Design a protein around this ligand. Structure first.
Ligand SMILES: *[C@@H]1O[C@H](CO)[C@@H](O[C@@H]2O[C@H](CO)[C@@H](O)[C@H](O)[C@H]2NC(C)=O)[C@H](O)[C@H]1NC(C)=O
Ligand SMILES: *[C@@H]1O[C@H](CO)[C@@H](O)[C@H](O)[C@H]1NC(C)=O
Ligand SMILES: *[C@H]1O[C@H](CO)[C@@H](O)[C@H](O)[C@@H]1O
Length: 372
């Protein structure tokens, strides 16, 4: 059956109950429709848990309340917990989920203790498809996948976070992919101020194919090792256009000492990247979250194996010219990275790669003085 949630038509009226009742009524194998030209006001967490092989067609605007007191410390704006079989999609392409994040960014700018929710938070479950829609101005992370979710596909998404003030949209990661298997991200555009895609602990079998990121911190493994032994494996990223990003791609691990654990990264390929005014084409950080003196006494021991960086082109920014990559592998770790078709230059035309603890078969000429 097909259900259309009743739109209250006013931002002071929360539409969430109407939406979850529609999902409860039709979500066992049915369809829920937000019609083209509609606006729904979501003034609380939208929990999609009653979905079981359901199809949620978003053709209108779902506008979340900014209500910073309400959202304070909350996990998710849209919560997708242990759902098996979901399609959350715009079939017209007109659907927009607006996180209304401005107030959160401004509050966080003045008070770093302010804790913000993730816009689309998937944990556990299986066979989830998210497609065709725009995500606008999330308070914090756009999309997260964890809890052992399997078979999750994000396709044809337009994601943008733009501040109307001088305070940037901090920590607006496009995709934080944690404990999961068989996640695919394809044909997505991201404009944000943090990681485009971050591979978090226990991510496995992730494919990212054709992505554009502007203003991001790159396609980034980690951070790993903060307080446990963390692994990322079997990752394939191809066709990334990285514009004005701090790095196009990289790996970040904590050093040893304290409560830090060991990081394992195996079989990760970054292929066919276009670098357009990004600060580094590639970066390895092995002293993440600590300083140089700390890392001298507490060396990094990350185990990186079968890391492939292939077919990178373009031009970095002025910032680190002549350096186009900073490969600071840990002193006690394995730095199993191979680079080929690396055609990236700084604006000057130079192409220096800083290295520490890199292997003899790296594939590009190294210069000493890597750090981070
Ligand atoms: C290295 O990682 C890649 C990327 O995940 C693996 O290739 C995937 O394997 C899974 C499971 O068989 C398939 O569902 C996908 O189709 C594959 N993805 C791609 C992009 O090819 C690959 O098997 C891993 N290699 C090793 C030796 O472990
Ligand atoms: C990237 O940065 C340059 C230099 O600041 C700027 O002129 C350009 O508009 C930015 N590009 C995008 C797509 O925002
Ligand atoms: C609820 O109403 C909308 C708009 O009329 C339909 O598109 C949908 O199928 C359901 O009947």
């Amino acid at each position: 059956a097909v259900c259309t949630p009743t739109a209250g038509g006013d931002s002071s009226t929360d539409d969430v109950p109407a939406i979850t009742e529609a999902l409860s009524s039709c979500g066992n194998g049915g369809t829920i429709v937000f019609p083209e030209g509609s606006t729904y006001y979501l003034n609380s967490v939208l929990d999609l848990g009653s979905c079981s092989d359901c199809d949620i067609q978003v053709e209108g605007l779902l506008k979340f309340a900014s209500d910073t007191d309400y959202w304070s410390g909350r996990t998710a704006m849209i919560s997708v917990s242990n759902v098996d079989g979901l399609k959350l999609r715009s079939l017209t392409g007109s659907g927009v989920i607006d996180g209304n994040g401005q107030d959160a960014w401004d509050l966080f700018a003045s008070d770093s203790s302010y804790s913000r929710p993730t816009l689309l938070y998937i944990t556990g479950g299986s066979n989830l498809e998210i497609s065709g829609l725009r995500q606008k101005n999330p308070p914090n992370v756009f999309n997260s996948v964890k809890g052992g979710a399997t078979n999750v596909v994000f396709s044809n998404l337009k994601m943008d976070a733009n501040s109307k003030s001088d305070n940037p949209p901090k920590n607006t990661d496009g995709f934080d992919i944690g404990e999961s298997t068989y996640v695919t991200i394809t044909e997505v555009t991201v404009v944000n101020d943090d990681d485009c895609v971050a591979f978090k602990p226990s991510s496995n079998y992730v494919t990212v194919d054709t992505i554009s990121c502007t203003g991001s911190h790159g396609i980034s493994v980690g951070s790993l090792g903060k307080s446990s032994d963390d692994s990322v494996k079997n990752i394939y990223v191809t066709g990334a256009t990285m514009i004005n990003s701090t790095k196009a791609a990289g790996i970040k691990t904590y050093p040893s000492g304290g409560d830090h654990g060991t990081s394992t990264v195996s079989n990760v390929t970054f292929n066919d990247f276009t670098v357009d005014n990004s600060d580094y084409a590639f970066q390895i950080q092995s002293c993440y979250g600590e300083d140089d003196d700390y890392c001298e006494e507490n060396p990094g021991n990350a185990k990186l194996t079968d890391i492939v960086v292939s077919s990178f082109s373009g031009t970095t920014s002025d910032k680190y010219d002549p350096v186009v990559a900073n490969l600071d592998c840990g002193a006690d770790g394995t730095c199993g990275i191979s680079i080929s078709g690396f055609d990236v230059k700084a604006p000057s035309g130079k192409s220096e790669v800083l290295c520490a603890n890199t292997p003899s078969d790296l594939g590009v000429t190294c210069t000493s003085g890597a750090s981070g």
